[PDB]
Structure formats: C-alpha cells, structure tokens
Amino acid sequence: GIFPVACSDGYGGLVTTDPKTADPVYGKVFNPPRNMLPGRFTNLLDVAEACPTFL
Amino acid sequence: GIFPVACSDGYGGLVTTDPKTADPVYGKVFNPPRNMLPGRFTNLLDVAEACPTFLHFDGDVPYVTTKTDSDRVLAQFDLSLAAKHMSNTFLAGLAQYYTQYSGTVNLHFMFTGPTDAKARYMIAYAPPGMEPPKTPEAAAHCIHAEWDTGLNSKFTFSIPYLSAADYAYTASDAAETTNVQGWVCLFQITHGKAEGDALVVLASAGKDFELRLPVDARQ
Amino acid sequence: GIFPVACSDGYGGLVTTDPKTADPVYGKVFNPPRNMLPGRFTNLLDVAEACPTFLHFDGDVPYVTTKTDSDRVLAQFDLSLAAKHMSNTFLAGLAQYYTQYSGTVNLHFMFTGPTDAKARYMIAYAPPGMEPPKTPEAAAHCIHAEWDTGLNSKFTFSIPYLSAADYAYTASDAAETTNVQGWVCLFQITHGKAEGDALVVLASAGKDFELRLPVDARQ
Amino acid sequence: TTSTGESADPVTATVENYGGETQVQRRHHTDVSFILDRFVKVTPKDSINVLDLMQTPSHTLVGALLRTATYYFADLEVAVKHKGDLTWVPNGAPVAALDNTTNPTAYHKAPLTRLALPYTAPHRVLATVYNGRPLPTSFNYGAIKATRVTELLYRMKRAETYCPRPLLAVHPSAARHKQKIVAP
Amino acid sequence: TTSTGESADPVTATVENYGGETQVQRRHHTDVSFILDRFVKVTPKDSINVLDLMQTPSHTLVGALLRTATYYFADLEVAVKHKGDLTWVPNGAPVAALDNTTNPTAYHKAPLTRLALPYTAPHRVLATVYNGRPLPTSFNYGAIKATRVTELLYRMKRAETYCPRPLLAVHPSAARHKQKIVAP
Amino acid sequence: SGNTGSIINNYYMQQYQNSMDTQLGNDWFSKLASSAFSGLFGALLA
Amino acid sequence: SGNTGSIINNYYMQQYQNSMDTQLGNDWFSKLASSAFSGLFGALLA
Amino acid sequence: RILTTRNGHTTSTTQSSVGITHGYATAEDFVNGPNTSGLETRVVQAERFFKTHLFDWVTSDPFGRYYLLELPTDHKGVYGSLTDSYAYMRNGWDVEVTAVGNQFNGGCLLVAMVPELCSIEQRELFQLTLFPHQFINPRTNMTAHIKVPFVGVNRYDQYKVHKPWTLVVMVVAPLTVNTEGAPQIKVYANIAPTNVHVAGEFPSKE
C-alpha cells in the first residue's frame, strides 16, 4: 500500500504570526552585495539606549 | 493509534513555478542515446557572449556610413536594452524576459570600406544627468576610445556598467523622460576618401554581464 | 503544538498507473506453495524470442508456393508490425500494446517439398525512399541473403533495424502513404521440379529487439 | 545462415553476416511485471461485482497481454467509484457475507477509493484458459458490493506469466494498417 | 583594443583599458535550466490537446526563450483544470487510445491536477525549427483528453538547448521604448 | 520489480501490502532465447 | 540543477520522477566565451 | 597570411585569409549509433570540393540582400550518386566563399551556416551573427572559410526530405567602387563534404 496518515481537525488553519515558511515560487536570484553598510541596528532597544530623546 | 498530523491552511495550492515534482504515472522507459551531440548550450548567456549580432539604424540597415559635413556625430543612442537600435540583437532578445541586469555590454565595429579609404573613429560613454555631447571635442572629456582603419578591420569596445544601484531595470518606464543609464555616442573624427563607405556594428555580452529575475512581459 | 504541514494543490488525485500501494485491509494469509512450477516466463519478449509463429499470405495460408513463370517475386510486404502478413504472429501480437520498438526481427523459412525437388531463394531488405525491387537482379544490390534446399530444411534471416531515429512507431499512421521502414522482398531464383511445393515462413524477435512505451490502443 | 528448420531449436542470425554490427537493447518496457502494472477499466454491475481478471476487454492493453499466458499469478489493486460503503469479501466466501460491515468495508470518501488486495485463490496459480468456455468458479479474487458502483479498475501487482499463447493484431484489408497518428 | 573584425573570434575588451576594474558577476538568473523551469499558459482545446511546446505563445517568457534554440530537450510537467477524467497517452500512440482508462488517468480532484511526464519522443532531441512552417508529427509529448479542459500549463524540466537563434525585442517608434513601471 | 517509484520504504509491513510467498522442497524462455545459434553452419569464404 | 527547493530526498525513485538518460560510445559556448581576447593588440604607452 | 586547404585530391590556396571558423564543435560526434545496427560505412572518395555560383554583388543591393543556399545541393560527382544509392547519410560541411574585387572596393558581406533555416524575418537579420560566420571586407580578405559538423534530430538524415544546413550570404554594407575598384563583384563558393557516412543501399532501376 502507501503510508497512511490522519488529517487532524483544528490544525492547519492559517495564523498571521505562525512560525513557518511559504513554498518558494521563483528561485536563483542573487542580491547586490550590501555587506558592511553604515548605521545598522539589529535590535530596537539598542537604539533606545544609545540615543536619548526629549521629554 | 496512528501518527497524527495537522493540515495547514494557506499551503498546498498549486504554484506555476513551484519547486516540486509530479507523481510518476508510467515508468521504465529508456531514451535513445543522445550523448555528445554537436552544438549544445546549457546557458542562454554563453550563446550571447560567443555570437554577436547586428544593431539597427536609420534606413533599417545594420551599419552607419561615413559622412562629409560639419556634423561628425555618426550615431547616438540611449544605453538600455529596450532601445530601438538594440531591438534586433540577440542580447536585447533575452532582456525582455528578465527584469534586471548588470555588467558590461560589448560593441564590435568592423570597417567595410575599400583598401584605399581610411577613417578614424571615436566611441564614448555619456553618463546620465547631463545632455550627451554633440561634438567629439565635447565628448573627449568622457570615457572614450579612438581607433582607425588598417590591417585589422574590427574594433571591440566595452561599455562599463556604471550606476548607483547594483542592478538596473531592463525595461524603460513610461514615466522616464531621460534615460537613466545615459547614452553612448559614436563619432567620425575624419576620413580619407571614405565617402559612402560602411561601418557595420555588432553587440554582445561582456565577461561580467549578469541578468536576473525572469519575468514574462508578453512581447 | 503539533507538526505543521501544507496540503498541496494538484497532488493526490488518483492515477490509474501511479506507483504506490493500497492500504492493507485483511492480513496474515499464507499461499499454497507454488515454487518451481513448470513453464514460467517473467518477460513477454522471451516467449517471443523462443517461440516463432506463422505469417499470413494470400489464400490465408502461412506459406508460399513455388511458381513457374516470368514472375520470380515470391512474396513482398512492408516492414512494420502493423502489416497484414505479420498480423497473426505473436510478435505482432505484443506490438499493438506498445508505441515504439527497435532492434532486429528474425524470419524463419522451412522448405516443405519432397526430397526430389530443389529450389534456391533470395530474401532482401529494401530501405525506404525508393520503390522496392521487382526482380532479383534489381534486388541483388540491396542487403540480401541466398540459400537453397538440402539436408537442413530451415533458414533464418535477421532483418536489420535501420532508421534515422533510434526508435520507430509500431502503428502505421493513416497519413503515411509509403512505409517508413521500407520493405522486405522474397524471391525464387529457380526451382528443380518444385512446382506446387510449399515454403512455410515464421517470425520471431531477435537478440536486440526492444519494445517500449506501453499503451492501450483498444484493438 | 542455414540450418534444419524442423529442429524447432531457436536460430537467430545477426547483421554481422553481411558485415553489420549488432546494437544495444533496452527491453524494460516489455518486462512482464512492468507492462502489466497499471489500471484497466471494467464495465461494472450495479451492486455485486465479482473481482475477475477475465472481465477486462480482450483488446485492451492489459486485457490482451494477460490472455497470452495460460497460467498467471499476481496481486490486485482496485480503484472504485461508488455510492455508500464498499464491502469486500475473500475468495470462496458466501454471497450472504457481503452485507456484513465486519468484512473489509471502505466508507465513502470522495472522489473514489483505492484498495490493495492479496491473492486469495486456493490454486497455486490461476489460468486464462481452462479445459473442462466457462472458467471454474474458484478463479476469482472475491467480490465487492456497494449501493452502486460507477467505475471499477484493476491493477495487477507482481505479475507472473507462464506458457505463452497467441497474440493477434488487427488484420488490414489493404497492404498496411493505416491509422491517423497524433500530429501538430 | 583593435583587432581584425573579419575573424569572428570573440573579442571582449574590459574597463581596465582606460583604468577601470571589472566587477563580480552572478548569472544564476540567466541559466537555461533555471530560467525555463516554470509554468506558461497555453490556450486549450475543448477535448483533445496534443502536448506540444510550440503551442506556447512566442512572446511569453517561456515561449520566446524556447524558440531561440534550434534543438531542445526537456521533461514536462503539466497543470490542468478539467472536468471529468484526464487521460494521457504516450507519443505516437493512436488517437483511439485516449478513451481507455488503462492509460494513465487522473480522476478529478479540485482545484486542478498536476502531473510529471517523461520525454517520450523517439528523436534524441527535439527541434523548434524544421527544414522540410509545419513541424513533423513525431515532435510531441503525447496528448491528453478530458470531458473539457479549462486551463493548461507547461513546465519544462532539465531543459537543454543547442544552436541558438535570433531573439527579438519590441521595436520602438521613438528613441526609447517607454512603459509604465510599477510605482507607489 | 514492477512499476514503483518510491525511493523510501513502504509505510506498511511487507506482510500486509503484499501476500507472502512460500517455498517447497526469465527462467525458461530467457534460457531458451539465450541459446539461439548465431553462427554460420557452413565454411566461410572472404 | 533547475529550479528546485527541496533539501530532502525526492519521495519517488529517480527512475520514475524523471526519464533516465543513456550514454553512447556550458560545453561549447562557455568554452567559446572563455577564449575572448581581453588584451591590447598594440604596444602600450603610459 | 597564406592558407592551403586540401580535401581528397583537391586543394585551394588563399593569400589573403583571416583563418578558419569552426562552427558548434571542433570534431564530429559519435558516428556509429544504435539505430543503424552497425551497417554504416564511410565513403572516402566523396570528400572533395565542388564549385557553384552564388550571385553578383553590385552597388544597387541595399542592406539586407541575402542569398539562401541549401545543402546538400544537386551534385553530379560521386557525392551526388551516393544520395541515390543510400537511404541514410550524414556529413559535415567545409564551406569557402570567394568574392574578388580589388582592395579599393568597399562594403562588406556576412556569410553564415544557418542550421534549419526557414523564413528568417527581416529584423532577425540583425542578430544573424549568432551563427558561425566570417565577414568578407574587400579592404582585407577576399575569402571566407567555415567548418561545421552534422546537426539534426537524427543521427543519420535522409537528404531527400531534409536539408540540415543552409548557406546564407548577406550584405551588411553596400558596395562602393570609388572609381578605383571593380565595378561589380561576383560571389562563388567552394564546398566539400566531410565525414560522409552512408547506410541502406537501395535497389537499382533495372
């Protein structure tokens, strides 16, 4: 035969924040090299610690 | 029990370009051996580098004839792959199926005139932001090359890829009044007895020419 | 949570020839031991190589009789597996279920006449593109063999597979006026006292005969 | 290449006689197990259908190639489109059994239902032709019943054939058999 | 950089002549196998549709790039939206075969049906242009039949191309070809 | 052996998916076709 | 080789998913484009 | 720049020559295929030049003037007889084209071996350089020389119903005499088959 499976209820509905990836349509593109551009911040708190603002 | 699973929403819909394979219906066939047939090309750019093709000019001829008058501008056109001049080339043939490109585009010049006629030419690249030059003396400040006729009949000139963004659109947007990639200009410095003699021009990809993001634009 | 998954569109529809197995309902049965029964064949071509079968001729007889007249053409027919002559063979029996074939098709000849009669025959292959030969002298330029009667009653001749494309269609297309694979021609060179004596002919696959792409054509 | 035809020993002459060279063969597509593994249509009956490989039409690719062997063995895969609940029964079981859900029963799930069935007959190997027109009742894989069955398919698995038999083609009226071949 | 133009030997001058520096190239998007692998629409016919790559429009990205090579090879993936049961037939098989469920047949399962098909032609490699307007009937992947087919798509796999041919762009009337480009 | 395209092991035991064979105690036709005589019966000339 | 995104092995044998190639006995254009002459034909000055 | 080409017992010599252009491959693919059962043979005596006229290239011809020549053509030598005695053939082409004015003529020609040439579009000529070619520029060379293998969807072809190669000669620049040149230039071709192989003898007419 073939590998049996059980489609479960209450699973699979789309979730806006869900942690999984879309199926790629269109492949093999290369980006223009962006390495070491100035002024990068990976976390929105670090810019909050290093740049005080007015009251 | 049996292994449970969750059928997820928004997945599984068919995608024309999707990266997965159909379920085989009908098996165990063998092909007639095709190994080492002649003239194979695995990439559509390699055939663009190794086989230059003609341009297009007024009168619908792939050459420009020497002229005697105060006007030394031999031919002048936008640098784009949507230009009318490039339209007949193979190189501008692939472009219409891709959105963006980068790299060098080579131009080939071959002087057709008789052995008793001599001429000297100038090709130049006019970057965007200013009107292109109308005189060789004005163009002499740009990037340019200069060659004349002789034993060798052919000259090859590499048009640099010079732009702010690492890639440039192939198509020409309707809201673009002036070319973004600038112009290239071909001048005739002078000619010995060359009146009515033809210069055929060719175009092909360079070493670093790169083309990406396929799209079906109709056309 | 639980392992997420994406149900994909365009997959899972049933395919009559698909390569996968049903879910077993009812288990733990044992077969009566069948090991080493006689007369097994695992491939339908092997039975085609080891068991030649008769052809079909006018009067619906699987043989052709010697003739005395200016006409030495004994039998002549298309090389195809859709021919009327081949129609009764086992070899042309399998063909109708496959689209394409390649390789050699063997013909077997057995002279049935009495011990006091002697004849000499010619088989020849006429490739496509020209009308097939009407006289042995015309055919002598083709590929041919020649044999006569004697102690051994049987002769075997391999008809080559010779074509542009590595495979050839079994069926005969209605828009085909002239056979694509050419003809084979059987001649009678001469006969001692052989009037009214029969030559039975047989056909079977060769060593390299290969048959592929199954199809259900009705029939 | 001359020999004694009455011997019946197989004699295969080759092109090397007049100076040719024999080429390479790939016979996968004529393999018995390969060629017979696929679905073939059978005209069903409204409710009870006995699973029998001889119901396949004789001119179909699976039907014809089957009938060329006196003695055949294989498993079975069925593909059925039906209403209600498809109930299967093993060989030699009473007809009154098809009404019991205890026997294997596939509840209706669209579009159709595919099963895999073992070789259930008592005989070591079945037969296409039997000398005794009718074939003995013991040749069958069992039967299936449903409220109604719209389509039925057979797919043989692990096919094995024995003692080949004639295989006939269509007899042309003209010198060739001319059909319209797919063309652009 | 001067040379003899009549040689036809490729000559690529570089920016280093007047003092530039050549940059790095990434050509993945122009790779033949990469660029030709995707679906392209073909206007179907109600019932029988012969699978042929030349039916693709010449101006489409897959159609145009196909026609630039005289000799091409590839497998095929189809995506079909149809009513009834989609039946496929290998190359060179009679048209009367499309009516047999024994041949590969995909029962209707919404929204559509995707198959993967092998290269079935006898010729070692197919051709976009043939010298003999018509192309020989032997160039095709076979045909498909259904009660009706609403849409049809072709996707080439493992594409291989040989002997390139002209590829033309649209010829502007003005000095440039000006189109409206996507903008916010 | 037949037409099967799975490169991964079948989900169900071999004992279920198929019927189990037993033993007791192309076989014939390929061994027949392999014995075909390809030679020339008489002396060869040229 | 083409556009394929699966990092896991295809579920069906290579023999089914694709047609099997055979042998007998960018190839040309890349070997052509790699021979392009980038040099200067005459003597260089400055 | 002297070049001597010998095929069979025939030769050609050119004092003004730009060299040879090898189309699509340097050497023939596999000759012996599965489809002929090894019954193919090589014909040595068939490889040699033969000459034919193309056209007369005059000032009035504008850009785009083109001349198709399909190969093989009608041939009265040994190579012609083969086509009637054998149902399957293959071969490569070694092509040479010669247009002689003097060095004071002007204009240019483009010769190319185009496989499977059917109704090329006018605009498509601007890209015609994609195929193997050489320019004839009377300023420099009087001779164009091209070598190409056998191409086709079959390993052997039937030259009755199929012509794989087509020689095409196009005017990229119109002729100019400038009073010191030849008034018009005649174009000839010198062509030889290569690597001919045949199979499948026909019967005769008798």
Residue numbers in the entry:
A (entry chain 3): 1 to 55
B (entry chain 3), C (entry chain 3): 1 to 219
D (entry chain 1), E (entry chain 1): 1 to 132, 157 to 208
F (entry chain 4), G (entry chain 4): 15 to 39, 65 to 85
H (entry chain 2): 13 to 218
Copy text from the publication.
Foot-and-mouth disease (FMD) is a global disease of cloven-hoofed animals, highly infectious, and antigenically variable, which poses a major threat to the animal industry and causes enormous economic losses. FMD virus (FMDV) is a member of the Aphthovirus genus within the Picornaviridae family. It is approximately 30 nm in diameter, forms an icosahedral structure with a sedimentation coefficient of 146S, and consists of 60 copies of each of the capsid proteins VP1 to VP4 (9). FMDV is more highly sensitive to acids and heat than other picornaviruses, which is conducive to virus infection and replication.
In this study, we focused on improving the thermostability of a type O virus that is less stable than other FMDV serotypes. FMD serotype O is more thermolabile than other serotypes. We first demonstrated that the wild-type (wt) virus was completely inactivated after incubation at 58°C for 1 h or 61°C for 30 min. The wild-type virus was highly sensitive to heat treatment and showed a highly significant (P < 0.001 or P < 0.0001) decrease in antibody responses after heat treatment both by ELISA at 21 and 28 days postvaccination (dpv) and VNT. Multisequence alignment result showed that alanine (Ala) at 13th amino acid on VP1 of FMDV serotype O is relatively conserved (up to 91%). However, strains from other serotypes most often contain threonine (Thr) at VP1 position 13 (serotypes A, C, Asia 1, and SAT). To elucidate the molecular mechanism underlying the stabilization of mutant M3, the structure of the SDG-purified 146S particles of the wild-type and mutant M3 viruses were determined by single-particle cryo-EM. Icosahedral reconstruction of particles was achieved at resolutions of 3.1 Å and 3.6 Å, respectively. The maps for the viral capsid were of sufficient resolution to build and refine the atomic model.
